[PDB]
Symmetry: C3
Subunit: 281 residues, 3 copies
C-alpha cells in the first residue's frame, strides 16, 4: 500500500480517436493502440494535464471530461466550438485543485475522485453515437496520501454491454488473494443498472474504503448507477472469503441473463482456483 | 450570510389555477401561478400554515415531503385532506431541530431540500396533477447554513424540464463568484441523471463539504427518480471561468430529446465569452 | 428494546425451498411454513451461521446471500457447483466479521448491514425465475451497540409487486405512536423504484439514524432503488406527526397507481387509528 503524492505537475499526453476493428471507435495513447475503454488517465490533485488530441476519423469528434476543472474552451462541445474537425488536432487543458478553505470560510471540495472522459459530438451533440461506439475512458484524480492499489480495472456498463464486448464475454480479471484491487465503474447510454460483486463489498464514498471507525459511509455490494455515473473502490481480493471464480454482474435480472456478467478470478498464491471450470460458467 | 435559528409561525396563501395550454400550477396570488410553484423557505423550528384555495373544476391537494405534518394535512383522499373545486383549506407544516433523544439516539432535524405537490388530480397519487405542473420546492434551513446569492429550481418531470418544450432550457444566469443554489427535483415515470458541466458538488444535505473530514462524495452527475429532491450551492465559474455551461440529463436519448439547459456564467462586465446564442 | 451485543456465536438454522399456492415459491424455517419474503435472519457481527438447506422442489434451487462472508463453495451458484438438486440438501455457511484495522493498516468495514438472500438457479443461472416467484428474504447483521427495534417489517419491491402480493393489497403494518419500528427494504427483478413514506424520514446511511450532529448523512423520505439493493432504517412511529394511516408507496407514478402502495397504521395508545375505517 503506497500513497499518492501531492500533485502540482504540468503533464502532457497525446490522445487519438481512431476506428477500431468491427466498426467501433476508440481513444488511444498512440496510433493503432486505441482501446475500449480508453486509456486510464491518472493525476494527483493540483496537476494540470494538457491533452494533445488528434481526430483521425472522418467526422468531428471531441473530448469532454467529468469532475476536473476546465475552461469553456476545453468543454469539448460543438456549442462552445471545442470539437475537432476530421483530421484535426486540438490541445485540451484539464486542471485539478486541492481542497481548501475559501475566504468566506467555506470548504472548497477538491478535484479528487473517480471520473471519466468521453466524446460529445459523434452522432448527436451529446456524443450519443460516439459513446455507443466506444469513445469513453476513465480518469482517476488522487488525493495526497490516498492508498495506491496493486492493479486497476475499469468496468463500463455501456447500454447492455460491458466495455462494448459481446454478450457473456466478460471481461474477466485475475488477482491473487491479498491483492489490493481497484475497480473503476462507469455507466453510459440509456439504461439504469445495479453493479454487484459476489464475495466482496465496499464503501459508497470517494475511495470505496472507510477512513476509520467514525466514517458513517454505507457498506454495500450492490450499487445503482445510470448514464454518466462514475464511482470506484479498492477491495482486498478474497478477503475473508478466499480463492475462487467470483462473479460480478449487473443485478437487473434480464441484464445478467443477457450477458452483463464477468469474473473476478482470485487465485491462491500457487496460482490455482479450486473448482473453477469455465465450461460451467 | 447565515441562516438563523427558526421558530417563527408563518402564514401564506396558495392557489391552484389553470395556466396556458392546459397546465396547472401553484401561485402566491391569483394570476401568478408558476411551474414550478413558488419557492417556500423555512428555518428549522418554523411553522407554516398554508391557506390553500382550489380554483379548478377538479379536487386538488397539497402534499409535502420531509416536513412534519399531522394526518389531517397529508393532502390525500385517504385522510380526507383534498380540496373540492372552489374550496379552501389550511394546511399546516411544521419543522423541528435535531437533538439527542433520551435513549442516546439523535433525532434528525427537518432541514433539507424538499418539495410539495398535488396528490389527487388524475389519480389518487396526483399523477395528472404532477404531470400538469402542480409541484414546487421547499427548502428548510438549519441554523448556520450558508445563504446563497440566488436559488434556481430544476425539475425533471417525465421528459421535460419544468414542463417546458424540448430544447427550451430553462437557462439561469449568474456572475462569476456568485453563490448559486440549485434545487433539483424529479417527478413522473422515469429515472434520470442530472449533470452540470464545469461544476461539482457534494452528495450530502447542503451540497457542500463540511470540511476536510467530511467523507461525502463529490460528484457532477446524480441519478434521480420520481420524487427525489436534492440541492447544492456552487460558486459560479470557480476554477473554470465565465461561459455558457450546459447542464443536462445524461441519459443519452433524454439529452438528445431536449432535457438540456444553460447555466450562463457571466464575466463581471456581464458578457459571456464564446456564447453565440 | 436493548442494544445488540458483540457477536462470535456459531449458529444453525434449517431452511426449506417449497412450492406455495399459485406457482409461487418460497423459503421456510420448517416445511409447510414457507413465506414470501422468507424468514428474517438476524446475526451479530462475528457470528457464523450454518444454514442447513433442503430443496423440496422438482428443479434445482440455491441460496445466495449479499454482504456476508462465505467461501466459494457457499456461492449458491450452478456455475461454482453450489446449487442443490431436487430433493437434495446442503449446508451453506455464512460468516460475519467486525470492523477493524487490516494488516496493511487501513480500516476493514464490518459485515453489519441490511442484507438479503435469494435463489440463483431457478429459471436461469441468475435465479430470475426463483426471485420472480418469491425466493428471497432479509438478513440483518447488527453491530455491537446498535439500538434494537420493537418490531421489524420487510418490504420487497419485486418487479411491480410488493412482497409478491396482488396489486392494491398492501401490505399494511401496525405500530403504536412511540414504537421504534425497523424497516428492511429490498428490491428485485427488472425495475428501478423510489420508496417513499408519508409522515416519516430516515437517514441514508447504515442504520437509518444519524450518529450525532456531526453525521453528514442525508436525511430523506424518498429513496431510489434497483434490483438487489437493500437498505433499512428505524423510525419512531408518529414522531412529531401523530397517529393515523400513514401511506407508503413507490413514487414512480404508474407504480403507485397500479398498486405498489400500503399503510403504516400508527395506533394511538387506546389502539385506535384516527381517520381510518376498514
Ligand atoms: Cu455533457
Ligand atoms: Cu444492467
Ligand atoms: Cu458526460
Ligand atoms: Cu404520496
Ligand atoms: Cu432524463
Ligand atoms: Cu411526493
Ligand atoms: Cu449473483
Ligand atoms: Cu416502483
Ligand atoms: Cu443477488
Amino acid at each position: 500500500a503506497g500513497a499518492a503524492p501531492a500533485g502540482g505537475e504540468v503533464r502532457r499526453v497525446t490522445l487519438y480517436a481512431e476506428r477500431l476493428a468491427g466498426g467501433q471507435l476508440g481513444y488511444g495513447l498512440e496510433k493503432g493502440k486505441a482501446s475500449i475503454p480508453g486509456p486510464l488517465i491518472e493525476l494527483n490533485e493540483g496537476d494540470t494535464l494538457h491533452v494533445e488530441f488528434e481526430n483521425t476519423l472522418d467526422v468531428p469528434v471531441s473530448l469532454h471530461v467529468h469532475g476536473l476543472d476546465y475552461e469553456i474552451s476545453s468543454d469539448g462541445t460543438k456549442q462552445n466550438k471545442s470539437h475537432v474537425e476530421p483530421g484535426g488536432t486540438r490541445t485540451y487543458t484539464w486542471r485539478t485543485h486541492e481542497p481548501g478553505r475559501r475566504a468566506d470560510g467555506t470548504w472548497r471540495a477538491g478535484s479528487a475522485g473517480y471520473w471519466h472522459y468521453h466524446d460529445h459530438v459523434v452522432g448527436t451533440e451529446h456524443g450519443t453515437g460516439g459513446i455507443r461506439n466506444g469513445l469513453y475512458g476513465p480518469v482517476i484524480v488522487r488525493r495526497k496520501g490516498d492508498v495506491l492499489p496493486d492493479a486497476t480495472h475499469t468496468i463500463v456498463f455501456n447500454d447492455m454491454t460491458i466495455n462494448n464486448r459481446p454478450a457473456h464475454t466478460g471481461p474477466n480479471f485475475e488477482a491473487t488473494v491479498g491483492d489490493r484491487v481497484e475497480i473503476v465503474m462507469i455507466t453510459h447510454g440509456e439504461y439504469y443498472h445495479t453493479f454487484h460483486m459476489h464475495g466482496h463489498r465496499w464503501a459508497d464514498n470517494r475511495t470505496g474504503m472507510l477512513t476509520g471507525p467514525d466514517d458513517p459511509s454505507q457498506v454495500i455490494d450492490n450499487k445503482i448507477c445510470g448514464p454518466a455515473d462514475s464511482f470506484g473502490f479498492q477491495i482486498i481480493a478474497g478477503e475473508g472469503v478466499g480463492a475462487g471464480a467470483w462473479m460480478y454482474h449487473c443485478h437487473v435480472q434480464s441484464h445478467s441473463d443477457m450477458g452483463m456478467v464477468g469474473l473476478f478470478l482470485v487465485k491462491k498464491p500457487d496460482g490455482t482456483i479450486p473448482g473453477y471450470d469455465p465450461q460451467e460458467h
